[PDB]
Structure 1
């Protein structure tokens, strides 16, 4: 039995090799942005409403054309076979059964067509390749396989400096490969090339500046993920949760606005929603559950998060996610 997401982190540290746990847990540089993602959520307090009708509380949302059971998707995390032998297939099967979208990675350790064949709501995360034609081919493969959205990661012109990995001399085991297979920095021109070559919604992941959110809408994005990449890219980048309210105001409903970084409970989902997010992504906790107990571990994590989101929404007087977005918040200390 697991009663919080923190129970799963302890289970995963026992089972995984140290250097793989460090690859999962770590950030870039001094890990200032990794810690700040948690500090920022801990400073937000919700002002709940009372005495509202809760006869039919629902945690469902509609996003990118489809119903999802929670305002949550599994974040893209590369190389999931590092954590469990069934890797991405275990996570995708659990996400499908929970009604949660799963983001298939460009650097998945099982091919995107195999993961898409599990069913559910697969999205596909794109890293730009040095060849525009090859980049567009991955997009076309994902679309042909039934992925519903292209999550274009825009905060990785190159990878950040993971000092835990450097100190550990970490490298991919020979038994893990990039099953979909030279990368290059993406620009606004790359976004337009993707947008022109797919009918799927393009979601830009890694936006933090208000004018980049506005330009994303102008560029035809269907969504953005407000994110500092889990503290793994620029060390010292502001947490997404601290930019979210200002970005939601600036886009004025022109695209979906997701957030990630440090979501560790249903109450954290409520905080993100109250600051204006359409939905959240969850990364590390899903891998903790995968490492601890495979598919069934991910299922249990998603069941726990669903219960915690429903509990927080109802205690805050919200019969729907839209009502949660109209909650007010107040910043505290520590």
Structure 2
């Protein structure tokens, strides 16, 4: 509650939560988050066929159990762009957080730094860098930009992020206009508070505004020059985020990207597009070790983390389930989810004969041509 908060009443309770599986968290969160903001978080484009595809894609490649593999206390730690992290997942950049919990991004930040991974800060955060920093307590962070049409504004934002301690920049390029998000349209959803970091290029405050109008204020005519100019201007490794087609990965690397972030924005953008995990092997094969790959869009289980790594990702990024955890328990709730994914992965590692994160990368997967219904 600052200049924004009105009749939007986000949960405020802080507690650890029992996570049996992350799927149940959606319905659980529907009972604590205001209808508009909940459906903004949970919903996807069209009739959500592609979000369902993100989920069902994991049944296309199945894990073998493996035995007498000489493996005992699996270690989930890994390293990406110099950061040593407790497990091979990071927090995806997500604009929402105040929609889910009054402690907002600072809540998520505390869970992420206490767990021991990397926080990605969305340009569309409801919290300032200062507020997020207090939650991170010096933990690592990456900053995600939605580009302004005005170059000076981009250079200011990047300077603020770097000054704040960002050690990579995430260029989200799959959102030059909004997806067709039927739930938000039908609800007439509107952000109930401000976006302090991108404020400088919105007609007024984000507060009364639709997402369609926030994107749209952003840069539509993103080109490979933008990738080069952001890497050049910031001193920092640049990820290009939203990639589903291998030619865009070759393009981004040749334009100076230091990482490829394979994603379909959790199916919130282009409708009637593939499940994200289905696109990963061809992108990995084109990238061919040139830069690290972050994978997201549909990760719900430790099995999914293992499959992504076997298929070419260095790490995955987590989204909705952590935000559902934040709704239900603030920072401790979000931490419960992160802790669930580590323990879930540890079980999968033991059963697949994987001693460490590198072993996961060499797993052979069973191909399932029958799909979901088998």
Q: Indicate whether the TM-score tops 0.5.
A: yes
Gaps of at least 5 residues in structure 1 are none
Distance 1:102 1:88 in 2: 10
Q: How many aligned residue pairs are there?
A: 332
Q: Tell me which of 46, 55, 60 is aligned to 1:38.
A: 55
SS of the aligned residue for 1:171 comes to coil
What's the CA shift string for 1:127-174, capped at 9, x where partnerless? 01011111121111111111111011011111112111111111112x
What is aligned with 1:140?
Answer: 159
Q: Which residue of 1 aligns with 2:188?
A: 169
Relative distance call for 1:259 and 1:71 in structure 2 (3 A) is same
Please name the residue that 1:131 is paired with.
Answer: 150
1:184 to 219, 240, 248: 219
Whether 2:193 is the aligned partner of 1:158: answer no
User: Is the Cα–Cα contact under 8 Å of residues 72 and 350 in structure 2 kept in the other structure?
Assistant: no
Mapped contact 2:263–2:296 kept (Cα < 8 A)? yes
Residues 319-330 of structure 1 aligned to structure 2 (within 5 Å) = 319-330=355-366
Give 3-state SS (helix, strand or coil) of 2:31's partner. Answer: helix
Q: Deviations over 1:286-332 (max 9, x none)?
A: 11001111111011111111100111111111111111011011232
Q: Secondary structure of 1:215's partner? A: helix
In structure 1, distance between residues paired with 2:356 and 2:237: 24
TM-score between both structures, scaled by the size of structure 1: 0.96
SS in 1 for 2:23: helix
- Bigger Cα displacement from structure 2, 285-294 vs 218-227: 218-227
Cα drift, residue 48 of structure 1: 3.8
Which residue does 1:64 correspond to in 2?
81
Measure, in 2, the Cα distance between the counterparts of 1:48 and 1:123.
35
Measured on the aligned residues, the alpha-carbon RMSD in Å equals: 1.3
Matches within 5 A, 1:188-227: 188-227=224-263
Distance in 1, matches of 2:35 and 2:367, equals 36
* Equivalent pair of 1:26/1:162 in contact (CA under 8 Å): yes
The residue aligned with 2:15 is: none
Cα distance in 2 for partners of 1:27, 1:134 equals 30
Q: Distance in 2 between matches of 1:277 and 1:9?
A: 26
Task: Provide the C-alpha distance between the structure 1 equivalents of 2:186 and 2:249, rounded to a whole number of angstroms.
Answer: 36
Residue 55 of structure 1 and its aligned partner are, at CA, apart by 4.1
Q: Does 2:36 correspond to 1:19?
A: yes
Give the SS at the match of 1:330: strand
1:293 lines up with 2:329 in the alignment? yes
